Amino acid sequence: MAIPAFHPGELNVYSAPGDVADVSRALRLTGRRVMLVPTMGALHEGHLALVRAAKRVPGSVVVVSIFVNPTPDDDLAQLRAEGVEIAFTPTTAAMYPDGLRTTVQPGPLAAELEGGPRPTHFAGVLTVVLKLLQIVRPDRVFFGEKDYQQLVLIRQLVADFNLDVAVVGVPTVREADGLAMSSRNRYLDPAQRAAAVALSAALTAAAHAATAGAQAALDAARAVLDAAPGVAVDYLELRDIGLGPMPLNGSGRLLVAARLGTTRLLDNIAIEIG
Amino acid sequence: IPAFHPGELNVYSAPGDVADVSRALRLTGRRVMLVPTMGALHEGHLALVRAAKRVPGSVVVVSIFVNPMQFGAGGDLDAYPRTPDDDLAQLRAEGVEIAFTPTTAAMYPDGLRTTVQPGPLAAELEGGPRPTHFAGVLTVVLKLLQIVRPDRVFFGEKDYQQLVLIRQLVADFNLDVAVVGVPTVREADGLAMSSRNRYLDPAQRAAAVALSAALTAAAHAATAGAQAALDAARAVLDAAPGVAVDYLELRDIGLGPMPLNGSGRLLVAARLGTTRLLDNIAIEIGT
Ligand SMILES: COc1ccc2c(c1)cc(C(=O)NS(=O)(=O)N1CCOCC1)n2CC(=O)O
Ligand SMILES: COc1ccc2c(c1)cc(C(=O)NS(=O)(=O)N1CCOCC1)n2CC(=O)O
Numbered sequence: 001m002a003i004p005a006f007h008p009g010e011l012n013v014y015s016a017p018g019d020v021a022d023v024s025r026a027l028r029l030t031g032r033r034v035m036l037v038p039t040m041g042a043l044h045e046g047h048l049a050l051v052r053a054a055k056r057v058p059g060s061v062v063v064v065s066i067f068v069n070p071t072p073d074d075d076l077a078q079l080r081a082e083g084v085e086i087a088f089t090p091t092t093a094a095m096y097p098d099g100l101r102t103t104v105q106p107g108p109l110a111a112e113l114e115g116g117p118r119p120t121h122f123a124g125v126l127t128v129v130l131k132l133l134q135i136v137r138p139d140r141v142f143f144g145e146k147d148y149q150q151l152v153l154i155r156q157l158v159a160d161f162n163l164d165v166a167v168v169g170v171p172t173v174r175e176a177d178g179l180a181m182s183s184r185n186r187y188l189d190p191a192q193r194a195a196a197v198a199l200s201a202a203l204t205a206a207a208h209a210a211t212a213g214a215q216a217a218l219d220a221a222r223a224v225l226d227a228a229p230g231v232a233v234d235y236l237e238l239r240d241i242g243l244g245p246m247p248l249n250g251s252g253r254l255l256v257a258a259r260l261g262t263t264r265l266l267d268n269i270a271i272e273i274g
Numbered sequence: 275i276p277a278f279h280p281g282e283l284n285v286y287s288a289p290g291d292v293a294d295v296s297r298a299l300r301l302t303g304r305r306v307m308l309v310p311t312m313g314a315l316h317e318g319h320l321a322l323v324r325a326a327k328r329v330p331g332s333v334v335v336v337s338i339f340v341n342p343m344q345f346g347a348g349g350d351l352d353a354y355p356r357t358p359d360d361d362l363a364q365l366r367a368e369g370v371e372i373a374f375t376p377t378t379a380a381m382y383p384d385g386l387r388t389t390v391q392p393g394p395l396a397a398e399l400e401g402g403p404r405p406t407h408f409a410g411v412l413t414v415v416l417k418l419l420q421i422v423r424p425d426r427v428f429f430g431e432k433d434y435q436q437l438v439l440i441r442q443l444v445a446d447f448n449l450d451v452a453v454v455g456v457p458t459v460r461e462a463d464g465l466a467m468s469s470r471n472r473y474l475d476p477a478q479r480a481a482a483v484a485l486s487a488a489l490t491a492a493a494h495a496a497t498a499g500a501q502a503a504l505d506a507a508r509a510v511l512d513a514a515p516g517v518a519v520d521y522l523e524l525r526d527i528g529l530g531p532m533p534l535n536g537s538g539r540l541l542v543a544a545r546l547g548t549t550r551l552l553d554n555i556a557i558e559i560g561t
Contacts, residue, residue, distance in 0.1 A: 017448060100393075102412065102439075102446035107387035126388070134448040160388035161413075162289060162420040 011080045013087045017095070017135045020088045024063065024136050032061040036138035036165075038129060041066040043075045046173040046181040050142040051082045053170045061085050063136050067095065069128045088136065095131060103127045106153055107160075109243055113149050113235060113255065114266070125150055126157050133165050141165050146172040146180050148253060148268040152243050172267075174200060180267045191230070192260040198228035199256050202236070203269035206254050210271050214238055214246060217271055221254060232259045238271060249273050283366045285373045289381070289421045292374045296335065296422050304333040308424035310415060313338040314355040314469030315364050318459035322428045323368050325456050335372040335422050336365055342378060343386060344410030355469050374422065381417060389413045392439050393446070395529055399435050399521065399541060400552075411436060412443045419451055427451050432458040432466050434539060434554045438529050458553070460486065466553045477516070478546040484514030485542050488522075489555040492540050496557050500524055500534065503557055511544065518545045524557060534559065 003026045004019045006012055014020040024034050035054035039047050047064075054062045063086040064079055066072075070092055079087055103123055109115075110122035133141060143151050155167050173181045178200035179193075188196055202224035209220035218238055225233050234257040238246045246252045255268040275298050276291045278284055286292040296306045307326035311319055319336075326334045338361055345351040365373050389409055395401075396408035419427060429437050441453050459467045464486030465479075474482055488510035495506035504524055511519050520543040526534050538557040543550060 021448070021450070098442075098445060102393055102443050103391045105389045105391040105409070107384075123391070131448050134450065137450070156384075157388050160384065160417075162293075162417045164293070164420065164423070 006085075008085065009083075010085065011076060011087060012085055013076065013089060015089050015091065015094060017088075017090055020063065020086065021135050021137075023086070024138070027061050028137070028139075031059060033057055033059045033140070034136060034138040035060045035062045036132060036136045036141045037062060037064045038132050038141065038143070039064060039066050039075075040068045041072070041075050042183055043078050044173075044181055044183070046144050046146070048078065048082060049173045050144060050170055051079075051084055053168065054140070054142050055083065057140065063088055063138065065089075065132055065136070067128065067132075068092075069124055088132075095128065104130055104157065107156055109149070109156070110153055112243070113237065114257070115149075116234070117264075122150065122153050126153060129154055130157065130161075133163060138165055140168050142168045142170055144172055145169045145268070146182070146266065148255060149243065155242075178204065180265075182265065184263050184265065187263045188260060192263065195228045195231050196260055196265055198225050198231055199258060199265055199267040202256060203254050203267055207269050207271055210273055212274075214252075214271075214273055217254065217273075221256065225256070225258065230260055234258060234264070241270075246273070278372075280371065281369075283362065283370055283373060285362070285375055287375050287377060287380065289376055289417075292335065292372065293421050293423070295372065296333075296424075299333050300423070300425075303331065305329055305331050305425045306335060306422060307332045308335045308337060308418065308422045308427045310337040310339075310418050310427065310429075311361075312340045312354065313361050314357050315361045316459075316467050316469050316471075318430050318432065318467035320364065320368055321459045322430060322456050323365070323370060325454065326426070326428050327369065329426060333372065334370050335374055335424065336370055337374045337376070337418050337422070339374075339376050339381065339414070339418075341381075341410060341414040343382070343389075343413055344407055346404055346407070355472060357469075374418075381414070390416055390443065393442055394531070395435065395439055395442065398529070399523065400433075400543065401435075408436070408439050412439060415440055416443060416447070416449075419449060424451055426454050428454045428456055430458055430467075431455050431554070432468065432552060434541065435529060464490065466551070468551065470549055470551065473549045474546060478549065481515045481517055482546055482551055484510055484517050485544060485551055485553040489540055489542060489553055492524075493555050493557055496538075496559050497561070500538075500559060503540065503559075507540065507542070511542070516546060520544060520550065527556075536561065 006023050037050045062084045065088040104126040106122045151169050177197045202221035206217035206221035210217040236256045238254050240252050252271045254271045257266045275294045278295050309322045340354050390412040392408045401408050463483045488507040492503040492507035496503040522542050524540045526532050527537050540557045541554040543552050
């Protein structure tokens, strides 16, 4: 049948999975490399940084998905401002025309860490990321490193189901005092917002303490969080980069999550032991 | 790209070799057709192959891989028939160009980790007593679909619940493949092909015609309604020596949560000694 209209150099918006699927396939056949940036709308500078990373690939056409897995005007304007040529904005019914039926079951990592208060969260994530990658068939898909467990789970999905996409993690964009960017940050009151910096300050102190070994890094991060009031830490864990157990020597990742009033914040950093 | 010699049987074990050859063929215009099998090939598998070969410009990839994740445990994996030499002889005789024969380590280098969780249909019928069976099937078929990226994938209708769940997988994860169901090839008396048929002794093989005779009596009985269709099938199964019926169920064609209307599928599973046989048929009610 006829390819949907696509106007190069402007923001083309599709809601129908089949429409974006046909346009992506037509573009790829024309010598473009399809880049997917999955979002849930409400775009912030962290999403812009995903887009800029995608746009850097020569020959790129950038597809930004906006889907809340169960404001439009402003998101699309930001996308236009960034030179993004494709926005995919499906309804829940278009993504799930048969309801919830076959789904993705993550490996046991999805039960750990975030998987504690939210046991089925990552099955949902992995299911819609899978569907997005099958609809759009991108050459590369971009995610921020803030939701680091999510990123690892995505790389396990890609390995395990033999998907033909490159997973690109982009360093977390941070506020000027280091607080990782988040939709949730606007909910903090001024005391909570001041206390919230302890997450990024604990992890950066740990990254530097790590020359003295893993225990020093963990104790430094704990002392920073202990200097903050009304920061209820859920976990502070050193793991290897794939979120297995931290090797005695080598590269790793330090992850923290805490509740400030009603707001849950997460951060993580690269750690190099000794 | 490893070597590909056209009009010869090319056998690849490494998922990256078949992926590269397939993508290269697709980019030169050939449509890639996948026939996934667990080996022990019979005439029903060759009908799948012939269906695939009829697609103009096709290149046919037949996968052979006894998938450990769909077997419970209780010796079933070890006992599955393996007939590698006859399988490859048959594919050469049919003109198949690509056989894909992955090792268990190439398919599951990290063990069982991310997997497909089917919808509720997987817990019905064959999956009632085997709750993780269809998760194993749909996980492997997804990986095979990803590695080979066929235009069309071909399955027999004999394992009809499996087929319906594979269409579910395809729709639910937006896979860009067409699923082609091919009608069950049958012995001359009607017995559905199966590479479990080898475990029927001569008495069991005689008795096993009752599954097909029961289904085809039911299809004709159906002018008189669902009860007459089921009771004709039941009568034939009951007259048969040493057939133990697991289930006999008439459902809507999608086997989903909707009542039977005009078009139905009648499914049977029965044990002859230790051998469990499946069959099914299209049923039109009245009309
Ligand atoms: C490259 O730097 C970053 C930094 C933070 C990021 C991102 C990237 C991406 C996200 C993010 O959560 N994206 S989202 O689309 O899953 N969704 C945004 C709207 O609120 C819920 C999170 N976030 C966190 C967030 O927005 O809550
Ligand atoms: C077109 O005619 C036919 C007839 C029967 C077929 C086929 C083709 C294909 C198969 C087959 O693929 N069976 S299976 O690998 O998916 N599997 C065998 C183990 O029992 C569960 C289904 N089988 C089923 C079988 O061999 O039992």
